[PDB]
Motif scaffolding. Sequence first.
Motif, PDB file in Angstrom:
ATOM      1  N   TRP A  15       0.820  -1.209   0.000  1.00  0.00           N
ATOM      2  CA  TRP A  15       0.000   0.000   0.000  1.00  0.00           C
ATOM      3  C   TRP A  15       0.861   1.270   0.000  1.00  0.00           C
ATOM      4  O   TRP A  15       0.576   2.221  -0.730  1.00  0.00           O
ATOM      5  CB  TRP A  15      -0.922   0.001   1.224  1.00  0.00           C
ATOM      6  N   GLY A  16       1.924   1.274   0.802  1.00  0.00           N
ATOM      7  CA  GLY A  16       2.785   2.442   0.884  1.00  0.00           C
ATOM      8  C   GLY A  16       3.692   2.764  -0.297  1.00  0.00           C
ATOM      9  O   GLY A  16       3.622   3.860  -0.850  1.00  0.00           O
ATOM     10  N   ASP A  17       4.537   1.813  -0.683  1.00  0.00           N
ATOM     11  CA  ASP A  17       5.498   1.997  -1.775  1.00  0.00           C
ATOM     12  C   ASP A  17       5.295   1.082  -2.988  1.00  0.00           C
ATOM     13  O   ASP A  17       6.215   0.905  -3.796  1.00  0.00           O
ATOM     14  CB  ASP A  17       6.916   1.760  -1.246  1.00  0.00           C
ATOM     15  N   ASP A 113       5.609   4.878   3.538  1.00  0.00           N
ATOM     16  CA  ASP A 113       5.237   6.290   3.501  1.00  0.00           C
ATOM     17  C   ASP A 113       5.505   7.030   4.814  1.00  0.00           C
ATOM     18  O   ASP A 113       5.080   8.178   4.972  1.00  0.00           O
ATOM     19  CB  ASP A 113       3.747   6.449   3.176  1.00  0.00           C
TER      20      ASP A 113
HETATM   21 MG   LIG Z   1       2.743   5.752  -0.835  1.00  0.00          MG
END
Ligand SMILES: [Mg+2]
Length: 248
Positions: A15-17, A113
Motif C-alpha cells: 500500500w505504501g510503496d 510512507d
Molecule cells: Mg505511498
Amino acid sequence: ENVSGISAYLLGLIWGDGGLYKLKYKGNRSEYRVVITQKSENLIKQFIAPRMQFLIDELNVKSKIQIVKGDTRYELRVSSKKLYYYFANMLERIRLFNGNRFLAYLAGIVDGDGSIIAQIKPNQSYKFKHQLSLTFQVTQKTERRWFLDKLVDEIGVGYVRDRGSVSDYILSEIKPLHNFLTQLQPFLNFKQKQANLVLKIIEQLPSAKESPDKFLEVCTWVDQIAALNDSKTRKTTSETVRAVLDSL
DNA sequence: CCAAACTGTCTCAAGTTCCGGCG
DNA sequence: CGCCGGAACTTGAGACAGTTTGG
Ligand SMILES: [Mg+2]
Ligand SMILES: [Mg+2]
Ligand SMILES: [Mg+2]
C-alpha cells in the motif's frame, strides 16, 4: 514471524510503496502483479525478498519473486493472479486486524510512507538556543486523508494536517511517542534504527538539558538519524549547535 | 524556558502502464 | 490467459525548516 504478521506487514509496504495491478495486454493476454518499489536494491534483498519468499512458499504460490531495475527505483514484483487477489481481499479485512497484526501492518505503512524525524530547531527562547524536536509522521495524498484519520482513531494520539495535494498524520508528544515507537519498533525493518535512536534521545532528553556536553551528545544522535534518512535539506546539525554554545 | 502545535518548503522516490516473449 | 523482463511514463511522497502558542 508467521504468515499472519508477514502478510500484514507486506500489505502495508505494498500500500505504501507499491501496488496491486490487474493488466490487460494486446493479443488477449493479461497479468496480475504484487509490487513493492524501493530506491535501494539491498534493502529489498535483505528485508523484503526473504519475507515475500516465505509467504509465497506458505501459500503455495508458484510465481517467482522478480527484482527489476527502473530508472528511479528498484522493483520487487510477483506476477501471480493468486497472490494478487489474496492481498486485494485482505485489504478489506484490515479493519479487523488485532493488536500485533495491526502493528505489523502499520510497520509496513511506516517503512513505506512514514518518516521518523529528529530535529534541532534554533529558538533563542531556550537555554541552549535550540529545541530538540522528535516526530513520527505518515504522509498520504490528500484523497486518502480518510486513512490518516483512521490512524488517529487507531493509535489514540496525534493529529492530521493538510498541506495541499498531500496530508500528514503527526505524533510529537514525547510520552505517547515513546510508547508508540516502543510498540512498533520490533516490526520495523527499514526504519528500525531511527526508531531506536529516537527512543534513546527521548530517554536522555532531560539529562541533555542539564549540560552543554550532554546536549551536544544527544544532538549527535539526531545527526545519525538524519544520516539514515533521505536527508537532503538539513541545516542545523550538532556542530552548528556546538558553535553557538562555544560563542556563549 | 520548555513541550507541543502551527505553517511552509526542498528534492526526490515512488507508483502506474505499455511492450514483446513464453508455455 | 496468465507468468517473465523490461522500461517508459506520471506522480506521491519524505524530511526537513521556520514560527507561534500556552503552561
Ligand atoms: Mg505511498
Ligand atoms: Mg511511498
Ligand atoms: Mg518510501
